[PDB]
């Protein structure tokens, strides 16, 4: 929750760790809660979909999310989304029923 990169070395707590999977479900639920159509003025999705048949050289590894030797994600992208998600939720909470 704080944004720290989880370290497998850290033992943690057995009881609290049971909610790690539950927290993952809330993250997906929160993403849908925040997902809504965006104005075409600042709609970045349309820009990449302007030409759906663009065929070109793939970008270098510097322009892609980092990966490790095994090839799976290093996990640094998750914390970026987490902080992004936190800001979105905080702003959304302002526009409440009141």
């Amino acid at each position: 929750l704080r944004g720290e990169k989880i370290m497998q070395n850290d033992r943690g707590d057995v009881i609290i760790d049971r909610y790690l999977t539950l927290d993952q479900e809330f993250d997906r639920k929160d993403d849908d809660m925040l997902l809504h159509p965006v104005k075409k003025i600042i709609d970045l999705d349309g820009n990449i979909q302007d030409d759906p048949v663009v065929r070109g050289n793939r970008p270098d590894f510097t322009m892609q999310p980092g990966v490790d030797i095994n090839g799976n994600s290093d996990g640094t992208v998750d914390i970026l989304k987490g902080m992004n998600r936190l800001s979105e939720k905080m702003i959304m909470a302002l526009k409440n029923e009141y």
């Binding site: 990169k5 003025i41 349309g46 820009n47 990449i48 793939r58 510097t62 999310p65 030797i69 992004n84």
Partner: protein, 752 residues
């Protein structure tokens, strides 16, 4: 206002006008009258789109030729902005002229952005959307339904409803933005995608992206409808070379070839099934092929080829099929052994760079495939797929890449290069061979445009130097100049920081990305600027990987904690939708006074059209020069090609490529002359790059700001921000930065 040029009456949609706009408008008119190409660079703080539309639209409405206007942008977002500006002018003209003159203006985009079908518009990729729309609009469903009403094949109500009305009555006279177009079409159950495409020939001004003009896959259909004497405008063309290069590029992977074999086997199985039951279709296609007809003759206007043409229309052979790939089974065997040859070439152990001619010779040796049949591979595959009743083409999708490779490599031999690398990612446990077909000459894709059209206007906010672009792209210009904004009081403070508060040099070089001293200095700079920045602060990083690494280090070091106190942190992400959501949240925070900081990539999706005017953008933090990845096979080959052909030094182009992106981000913070912000370039290497910046940015950069420190820069930022908040004296800007109608007449009289 309504002022006069030598003979052209132009109606400006504002009561006031900047001196730069009038000079910009005057130069554009001269270019159109004299004919030819021009490169005009104007500051981002002055209205450019409104000035372009005002003069160009007035030009056609007055002169007898009534030349149409072609507006080219780099992204779909800019299309909406231009259309909104386009709507502004026509509304003002209608009010002033007392009537709505006959005028049609539409934007053109993909199906994904204009699909109203409840079931086909819920996809995450445009390729799937196109396939589903084609299935319901190819005409197979309509013909099957007519023969047998019991057929379960469905149709699209939006597409069908268009047949009832005529093309001229699809939309009322006027300008229809994407937001307005969707609303109008939804109320009447019509397809905006088909409305615009069938209506291009009737539009006075048509707006689309560069891909619709440079990429042959989608350019040929649109280019055939537009006129030949129309005015062509290239807006924000400071990165047009990249668009041209990617139009004729391809990448092949082991997975793609593996999937291609599965598709080839499926096609062979399908041909056998069709042969057993319905062999007349094969004979009918074969008979037409023997005659000499091509996809254009056989395919109806309602349907489209399965494989989009990968080469320019002028490079397509006009002769008949060679014969080796005339029959379905023979073509499949021809296609199959080609895939096998590609697979064996991917088992190399070192990077191999070879020209297309050498690749063809080796192919002609190991196998017996000639050059000419390859050029027809894409054309032949589309015909075969069309006649095979392939309603579901999920398996055959992989074969499109193979067909594209064959046609591209067998067509061009100069300006193209093939790279085979055993390691797509050097940091991988197992090799992942990748084959890249690259275009080195950027003028090949834009050559047809500069010849088909007589007058072309190239305009942008940070297109400098203006001499390189004619060098890089083979064209000549009648005039090329850059304007300097005549602002009474300085509104933008460009500064360069070469060291931190500790006086230690700071740079964003990749090899020292994980440096405690450099990372801390940048983090302290980020925190310090967030303390004083009132509303919005945008930070651009050289690459996404650098941003990911440095941000993680900041989190561990606790730097992000201090930033969280004063501003919300929004970070660009690979997912386009998430990044769009971040922008909405970032704008909301700035508007409500909470304050937000946006971390993005200088070469990312945010920098390619998203602007931070007024409160949204008040401070631009350029963390290092956005240099490309030097140790890249694609870049090194292109650098060598330019050096040998255009005599452009490798270092010079690398500096030019990086500076244009840095300036691009700098110019996205000013909209009018009342907008202000601070632009800080944080790297020791920006110190000597002052001459490389745009003229209007270099002018504002003082000598004392060439090399500053974090503490010194912060002090200037605080002083500058305080000064800009004071009420401006009107008399200091009555007729030196903004002109009324009377002031403009004075300028005309004095000049004459």
């Amino acid at each position: 206002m309504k002022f006069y040029i030598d003979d052209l009456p132009v109606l400006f949609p504002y009561p006031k006008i900047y001196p730069e706009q009038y000079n910009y408008m005057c130069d554009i008119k001269k270019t159109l009258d004299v004919g030819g190409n021009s490169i005009l660079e104007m500051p981002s703080g002055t209205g450019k789109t409104v000035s372009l539309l005002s003069l160009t639209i007035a030009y056609q409405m007055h002169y007898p030729e009534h030349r149409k206007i072609i507006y080219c942008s780099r992204t779909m977002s800019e299309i909406e902005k231009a259309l909104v500006e386009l709507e502004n002018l026509m509304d003002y003209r209608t009010k002033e002229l007392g009537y709505q003159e006959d005028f049609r203006g539409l934007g053109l985009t993909s199906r994904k952005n204009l699909c109203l079908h409840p079931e086909v518009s819920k996809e995450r990729k445009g390729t799937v959307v196109d396939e589903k729309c084609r299935r319901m609009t190819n005409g197979q469903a309509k013909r099957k339904l007519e023969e047998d009403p019991e057929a379960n094949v469905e149709l699209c109500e939006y597409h069908e409803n268009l047949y009832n009305i005529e093309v001229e009555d699809y939309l009322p006279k006027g300008v229809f933005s994407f937001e307005k177009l969707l609303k109008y079409c939804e109320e009447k159950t019509l397809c905006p995608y088909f409305i615009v495409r069938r209506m291009i020939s009737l539009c006075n001004i048509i707006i689309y992206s560069y891909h619709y003009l440079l990429d042959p896959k989608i350019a040929e259909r649109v280019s055939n409808e537009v006129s030949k004497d129309s005015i062509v405008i290239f807006d924000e063309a400071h990165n047009i070379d990249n668009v041209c290069i990617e139009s004729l590029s391809l990448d092949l992977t082991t997975d793609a070839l593996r999937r291609a074999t599965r598709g080839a086997n499926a096609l062979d199985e399908r041909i056998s099934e069709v042969r057993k039951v319905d062999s007349q279709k094969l004979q009918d296609e074969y008979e037409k092929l023997v005659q000499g007809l091509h996809s254009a003759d056989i395919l109806t206007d309602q349907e489209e080829p399965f494989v989009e043409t990968p080469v320019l229309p002028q490079d397509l052979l006009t002769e008949a099929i060679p014969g080796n790939i005339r029959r379905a089974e023979h073509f499949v065997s021809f296609l199959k052994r080609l895939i096998e040859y590609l697979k064996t070439r991917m088992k190399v152990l070192h990077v191999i760079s070879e020209t297309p001619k050498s690749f063809l010779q080796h192919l002609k040796q190991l196998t017996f495939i000639e050059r000419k049949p390859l050029r027809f591979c894409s054309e032949r595959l589309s015909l075969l797929v069309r006649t095979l009743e392939v309603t579901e083409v999920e398996d055959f999708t992989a074969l499109k890449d193979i067909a594209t490779f064959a046609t591209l490599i067998s067509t061009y031999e100069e300006g193209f290069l093939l790279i085979i690398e055993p390691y797509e990612i050097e940091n991988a446990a197992v090799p992942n061979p990748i084959m890249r077909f690259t275009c080195l000459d950027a003028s090949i894709a834009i050559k047809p445009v500069f010849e088909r059209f007589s007058s072309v206007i190239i305009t942008s906010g940070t297109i400098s130097p203006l001499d390189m672009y004619p060098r890089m792209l083979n064209f000549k210009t009648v005039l090329q100049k850059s304007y300097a904004m005549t602002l009474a009081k300085k509104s933008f403070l460009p500064m360069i920081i070469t060291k931190g508060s500790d006086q230690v040099a700071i740079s964003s070089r990749f090899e020292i990305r994980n440096d405690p001293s450099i990372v801390r200095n940048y983090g302290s700079m980020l925190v310090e600027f967030a303390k004083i920045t009132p509303d919005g602060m945008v930070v651009f990083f050289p690459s996404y990987l650098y941003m990911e690494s440095i941000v993680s280090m900041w989190q561990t070091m606790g730097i992000l904690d201090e930033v969280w106190k004063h501003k919300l942190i929004l970070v660009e992400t690979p997912d386009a939708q998430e990044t769009s959501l971040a922008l909405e949240t970032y704008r909301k925070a700035c508007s409500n006074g909470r304050g937000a900081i946006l971390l993005s990539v200088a070469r990312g999706k945010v920098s390619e059209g998203i602007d931070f005017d007024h409160q949204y953008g008040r401070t631009v933090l350029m963390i290092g020069i956005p240099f490309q990845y030097t140790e890249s096979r694609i870049l090194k080959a292109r650098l060598e090609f330019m050096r040998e052909n255009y005599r452009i030094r490798e270092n010079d182009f690398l500096s030019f490529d990086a500076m244009r992106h840095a300036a691009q981000c700098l110019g996205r913070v000013l909209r009018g002359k009342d907008d202000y912000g601070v632009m800080v370039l944080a790297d020791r290497r920006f110190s000597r790059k002052r001459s490389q910046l745009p003229k209007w940015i270099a002018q504002g950069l003082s000598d004392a700001d060439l090399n500053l420190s974090t503490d010194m820069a912060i002090s200037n930022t605080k002083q500058f921000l305080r000064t800009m908040a004071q009420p401006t004296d009107p008399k200091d800007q009555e007729g030196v930065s903004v002109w009324s109608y009377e002031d403009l007449i004075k300028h005309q009289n004095s000049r004459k």
